[PDB]
């Protein structure tokens, strides 16, 4: 897994300056935000019950559960899905989602219990398959911001109600995303169960929350504990802190910041650097969460080299962590800035744009 | 889950004094020992690869693996067992263990893959069932300190070798316990795979380590990741710190301390307090890991009440956390002190014995 050189310099910055000098803007970061009180608690037996109770409390509030509901932590959303399918042992699973193909954990879990599986992004193909023997799973959204249409969501729930089928909402991102679109929480729509991810537009570790009718959640949690699928206390502490700190407005503001970010200095630099070399060609794109610099040079092989070099310049000189700083592609390759990142709250637009401009300039010294 | 009153006072001590004033001697504690550098790293994308690499390095060293081996973290030992059985899909699993009955995760995992399962603590019943279609699982020890006889361990491994069967050692405690008995690590005995727990005679969270032939470990880890069975980075950080800090001699010394602990002041107090009330009857027992106070009063109902009260007196006045401080039995009930606990390193015998004597005396004020 080549490129512990990024690991090296991060450790150097940590040693010489400290954690406040590091800014991970890559977007792909688990957020582990526990304090000393939490750490103390995790080193006692009462820690397990303490963080499970806090997760129940703040998770129910987040998921719009009522007094007949419970919320529990799973290691990942996939873990909650496996546990649910193992516990409920449905004959068939019907999966409604915004776009094909789905994430594979549901189908894989079905294969283990020998349940039939069908998926579709067409409400018509979903309704006519619902019966007493089907578990109905609705994925509420994608990180791309596509959502299930509200009227369709209600239609699926209605048919399930008429057929006595259990409705399980995969709100891995949807518990945040659909709410940005002014949709109610899954449990408020009448879902029997909901799962969400603790790091998708939330400042927690990757992790799963499962909430819903006490009886169902209990059965599923017991099943999950047989195989260590449930979240351990250190994970529950990270989840608690993510939930305690969560506010939808923070997310809305970060989307606004990306919408408003002044990227004109990139274009200015582009024109300026052609004095040096007419093959320099900075290509950028505004994104819903920030922006991406897709290329800096016309020749493809040199382009790669410089994007990585710029990534290192950003890390070394400004403490900004991005993807280019790893070894080659496999994931993105382009220099991506995600302004929804927690660390982006610690720096202004001016800092980010200056870091970007100066890091590119440094890469093109004649 | 009655008795957040223990949670309450722990939080009071934490606020008023701090974490160094708390000593969890109950024995049943997950040890989450990460530092600020670790916490910093967990808030970056490079954290996942960093702690996975450290776990591989220190886990291989702990488990006596060679250059052809890898060590990976699972959420729990049960998670590693499920992942292994899901990946290898054996027709039959043969489970050799020191005493019946076994822990259920293996049999439960077998039920999911429709594999046959057999267990026995008799080497004779194990050898004649081994064939090409059997996964052979040897549980090396119990926390009770019973171990598989070395010659039996070698016999099982030999038969498996002759039958081309895979040998998987459940060293959940055995990776420490069997070594106290001067046995080699599982991988050194020729096991293809080994699993151990990161909190059984080790200062880590509950968690699983799976080590062995690179190819096998890779297959199993990929299978585990389908369902979030693998350890997330915050858990890997706790495991790393447990492994880095691990030394067998520390465990040997704690066992010696328990062996040598002067408990005579308990007997002295017993005689002294009969002046007050001839129904007071302190009954204690030395344990391999420390000692237990089993009763303090002849009447059973009052006995219960006072044991809990003493537990609270220990917590309030001396910061010692034990089981009696929770609501009634279900687990132990008696006041147990486990000197293998990390927090026991922060206090001398004098402190513990004085805390115990004074806490009992306080409970019997006339």
Swiss-Prot record, chains A, B:
Keywords for the protein's UniProt record, in alphabetical order: Pyridoxal phosphate
Entry keyword annotation includes Transmembrane: no
Domain of life: Archaea
N6-(pyridoxal phosphate)lysine sites (modified residues): 200
Keyword Transcription regulation included in the entry's annotation: no
InterPro entries: PyrdxlP-dep_transferase_arc, PyrdxlP-dep_Trfase, PyrdxlP-dep_Trfase_major, SelA-like, UPF0425_MJ0158-like_C
Single GO molecular function: L-seryl-tRNA(Sec) selenium transferase activity
Cofactor requirements of the protein: pyridoxal 5'-phosphate
PANTHER family: L-SERYL-TRNA(SEC) SELENIUM TRANSFERASE (PTHR32328:SF0)
Subunit and partners: Homodimer.
Family: Belongs to the UPF0425 family.
Protein name per its UniProtKB record: UPF0425 pyridoxal phosphate-dependent protein MJ0158
Organism encoding this protein: Methanocaldococcus jannaschii (strain ATCC 43067 / DSM 2661 / JAL-1 / JCM 10045 / NBRC 100440)
